[PDB]
Amino acid sequence: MISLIAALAVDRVIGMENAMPWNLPADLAWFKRNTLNKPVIMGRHTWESIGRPLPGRKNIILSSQPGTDDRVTWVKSVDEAIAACGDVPEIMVIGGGRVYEQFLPKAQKLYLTHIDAEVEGDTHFPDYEPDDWESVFSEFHDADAQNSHSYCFEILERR
Ligand SMILES: NC(=O)c1ccc[n+]([C@@H]2O[C@H](COP(=O)([O-])OP(=O)(O)OC[C@H]3O[C@@H](n4cnc5c(N)ncnc54)[C@H](OP(=O)(O)O)[C@@H]3O)[C@@H](O)[C@H]2O)c1
Ligand SMILES: Nc1nc(=O)c2nc(CNc3ccc(C(=O)N[C@@H](CCC(=O)O)C(=O)O)cc3)cnc2[nH]1
């Protein structure tokens, strides 16, 4: 099974030139819980923004160019990225926009964080049709002393 995981503001914004103007440790805890011990596939821009390998996960980076860090696995196409995952129950695709676009048609589950924030961005999660997906889990949280905005975790499974 292939799954996508993302945090989206309104209008599906997931990225901007500068750092996002939110602080959501609860969302990062959620991303951790849902990705540990599974292979994660990311594109090279997302790799550069994370800055290190994510512990406890097989990290697979898509790039057209030769790799620059032997601690992770570098692949040059989508088919190679899936092959590099091996025989696992669930592959986690962690972005960014160009990567989500290519993997959406293959995905059976979406793990989405919807954030109550309006921001101008340059990168969006792909458009998806709510009726093509079943909402199996949803939980809303208010902002608090640690988290700057309200947010809702949702898991969707493809109909
Ligand atoms: N809010 C969230 O959930 C979230 C999640 C992830 C990322 N983000 C944000 O999203 C932004 C980056 O997204 P993005 O679309 O610019 O970048 P991206 O998808 O992370 O990376 C794109 C890069 O991946 C490589 N690539 C992609 N598909 C490929 C293919 N089929 N074959 C070979 N290489 C391929 C290319 O690397 P080369 O250029 O080296 O060829 C490409 O330039 C940042 O703002 C980041 O912080 C947000
Ligand atoms: N829901 C969700 N939220 C995100 O912020 C997110 N970010 C990415 C890409 N960027 C990042 C950036 C940093 C870390 C990170 O440092 N995570 C650590 C720390 C978690 C914690 O502080 O609890 C990790 O071990 O996963 C992960 C992904 C992809 N999917 C996402 N999905």
Residue numbers in the entry: 1 to 159
Q: What text comes from the article?
A:
Dihydrofolate reductase (DHFR) is a key enzyme that is essential for the synthesis of purines, thymidylic acids and some amino acids. DHFR catalyzes the reduction of 7,8-dihydrofolate to 5,6,7,8-tetrahydrofolate using NADPH as a cofactor and plays an influential role in folate (FOL) management in many species. The M20 loop of ecDHFR can adopt three conformations (open, closed and occluded). We determined the structure of ecDHFR in complex with FOL and NADP+ under pressures varying between 0.1 and 800 MPa.
Because little difference existed between the two molecules, only the B chain is discussed and presented in the figures. The space group of the crystal changed from P21 to C2. That of the M20-open crystal decreased from 32 485 Å3 at atmospheric pressure to 30 970 Å3 at 660 MPa. The M20-open crystals contained (110, 107), (85, 88), 130, 137 and 134 water molecules at 0.1, 270, 500, 660 and 750 MPa, respectively (the pairs of values in parentheses indicate the numbers for the A and B chains in the asymmetric unit).
